[PDB]
Each structure stands twice: as structure tokens, then as C-alpha cells.
Amino acid sequence: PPLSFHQEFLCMFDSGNDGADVGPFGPMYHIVGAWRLTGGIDEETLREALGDVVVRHEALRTSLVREGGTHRPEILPAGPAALEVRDLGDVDESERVRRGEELLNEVESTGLSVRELPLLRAVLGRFDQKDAVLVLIAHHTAADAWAMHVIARDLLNLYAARRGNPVPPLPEPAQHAEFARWEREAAEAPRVAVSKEFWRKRLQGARIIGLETDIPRSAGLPKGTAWQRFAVRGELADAVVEFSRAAKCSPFMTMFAAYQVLLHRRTGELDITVPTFSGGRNNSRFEDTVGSFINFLPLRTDLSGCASFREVVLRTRTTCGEAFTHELPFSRLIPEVPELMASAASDNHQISVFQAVHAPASEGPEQAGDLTYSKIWERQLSQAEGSDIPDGVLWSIHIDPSGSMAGSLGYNTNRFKDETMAAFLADYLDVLENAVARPDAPF
Ligand SMILES: [Cl-]
Ligand code: NA
Ligand code: NA
């Protein structure tokens, strides 16, 4: 079982054995999610189901241990099924959403090693016999956002079946090891050489844009990542969706375009390269597969001579189109363009990423047997010390089918002050509002 291309990418951010258990192979590099559960719960059966879902998915039993400078995967037997339960209190609805968010944040501030099991934990916060919040946490080498959606679906299905309630069969999943194999076969395909030649040309002289940090790398402050949560207001959300529809661009392309406009205004640059993370799940064989598939994907757009926001969005659409056509695993692309990140490691800058969360489509509450479950996307509570960002700034946007959007802005507290990032976020929301309100005005 070799490291995936994604895991190779993470190695590029690994601080090494250095006295500090931090970064992507440390215990804070995890992903958390929360679901509101309506219906009665048998806790013992839910715990058994959690055991079931770890047996089901090898990625959730694949530890990563330091060996000879790198990390060796080893697929282990599932550990003991475990579930923590808390009595959050029989309180009124607004207090429930609030206590749910607090539980989510508290779990995110706890650690979860990759070096031994478990790689998935669960905390169930119950309000009363028929309302609860289920929080899952998984190491982010083992699961991405799409994987967390799969874990929750599988878990509640396996639970329902144990309870003897009607649910459809789960498909047999492909294991992540199978994907690790497949992606290396794909890397030898003839289109690869064609795509490499595309990227060498496209990214000639390109440098990912850096954000100036408040605190230099050399100050050596302890690693931490904070998160500021935001939501795109109904009015603004509706304007973004309508603009995008009419422009024949996705809402993500619009929000990415607005980010480019913001960086142009912040840095003066017109030649703008900003990475996103693609979903990395083009191959539908792996749609029921738990693992971390996402892929660092550089998007270079030339904003020079743009007459309007609309033209920025259209150029973005072009850039996105050719990026996905020629997409390559970043660990294989970067040696072809080896100076692309020269502002990642600089003493006074970090790179930022702007991503859409990739997760299967859902509109409304879902049901498994006698349980209804609804992903909690709207977060408002910021986090002083949460899921780790190895080295940079991350914008993470969830775009709801309903029209609504929930976002997070994460940054390393050893490099940025909260106020700087607060202003950055507020500047972005203002740019976005003005852009879709007057998209054909001079930019
Ligand atoms: Cl993710
Ligand atoms: Na662990
Ligand atoms: Na029943």
C-alpha cells in the first residue's frame, strides 16, 4: 500500500521529526462534521455501527508511521468500537443549534493521531430522547469532505439495518488502496505527457500569489490554526446564483473571480495564480470510497485589460475549463514548474487556497430507517485552535443546492493576527457584493 499522490503532496508540508508533533501527520490535521439527528437512538447499536463502518473502509484503519524520512501506510484490524455521549440538555431550539455548534468546535479542538487507531471518532450530544447532534472527526489523511458524507450515510444505514428498519443495501465500496493503484496506472497514460506540456507553457514564469504575513516564519511561534466562519446572506446569495446562472458560470467561479479581484486590489497584481483543491473524484468507481482524494490545482488568470467583473468571471471560466481538462496530481506537476511555490516558504509570506467543498448533492434532510439526519453546514462560531492548515491560508466555501453558502477562512495563528483575517474576510464580502450588483461596470 503506497502513499497516494495526495499524501505525497502532504509530505511536502511535513516538518519532520523535530520535537513538534504538528502539520499533516500530526494529531490536529483532521476533518470534523456534524449532523442533526431526529428520532430515537439506541446508543449501543450506534456504537456497533461505528465499528461496522471502520471495518467497511480500509482508509479508516490505515495508520501512517514515520519510517526513514517518510511515512509508511499500514492497514490494521479495526480497533474497539467506541462512542462518547453527552447530555447537552433539554433546551429551546435556538439554544440547541448553539450548543450543537459549541460541541462541534470543542471536538475540533481535540487531537486525533494518524500513527495509531482510531482514525475516526464520534461524539453524540443528545438534547432529549428524539433530538441530538452527532459529531464525527477523522484524520484528514484518511478522509476528505466527500468521504465524511459517505461515512455518515454508511453509518446511519448500517445502524438502521441493525435495528431492523428498512434501508436499501449499501453498494460494495472500492477501497482507497485500489484508487492508489489506479491513479498510478493513469499517471503513465499518454495524455499525461500532453498535459505536462500544457502546464509547462501555461505556468511559464508563474508564481502562486503570496499573502504578506503579520508574523514571520523565522519568529518560530508555535503552530496553530484558527478559523473564522461566515455565511453568504440570502439576498447576496440569491444575487450570486442569479448572476452565475445568467452568465453560464458556476457560483464557485463567480466567488473565485471575486477573490481574484480582491487580490488584485490588495497586491496590485494582474497576473494572478491561486490554487484551488479539486474534488479528485472524476472516476465514478470511487464515489463510495473513503479516502482523501482532493488535488491542489493551480489556476492562473490574466486580469490585465479587463473592463468589468463579468470579464473576470469569463476568463476564470476559461482558466477553470482548461485546468480540469489537463488536471494532474500536483506532486507530479510541480517538478515540471519547480519555482511555482517560491512564496510558500518565504519568511514574510504564505500562499492561500480558495476551494469549494466537494460533497455529494443533498437538498434537505435525509432518512435512514427511523432516523432523519441533516448536515450542519451553517457555522457562525469562530475557532481559536482547530483543524490544522499545514502552511497557508485556506478559504473553504460550501455551496448549497438551496442557494445558500457557508464559508470558513482558516489561517495559522503563528503567522496571522485575527484582526488581519477579519478585515480580509470583510473586504472579500464587500468586493463580492459590489461585483454581482454591478457586473458590467468598470473594475
Ligand atoms: Cl476536504
Ligand atoms: Na489515532
Ligand atoms: Na423499528
Automatic annotation (TrEMBL):
Superkingdom, taxonomy of origin: Bacteria
Record InterPro entries: CAT-like_dom_sf, Condensation_dom
Residues in the signal sequence: none
Any GO molecular function: 2,3-dihydroxybenzoate-serine ligase activity
GO CC entries: cytosol; enterobactin synthetase complex
Pfam families per UniProt: Condensation
Residues annotated with Cysteine sulfenic acid (-SOH) modification: C320
GO biological process annotation, one example: lipid biosynthetic process
Domain Condensation: from-to ranges: 28-442
Protein name, entry field: C-domain type II peptide synthetase
Organism: Streptomyces globisporus
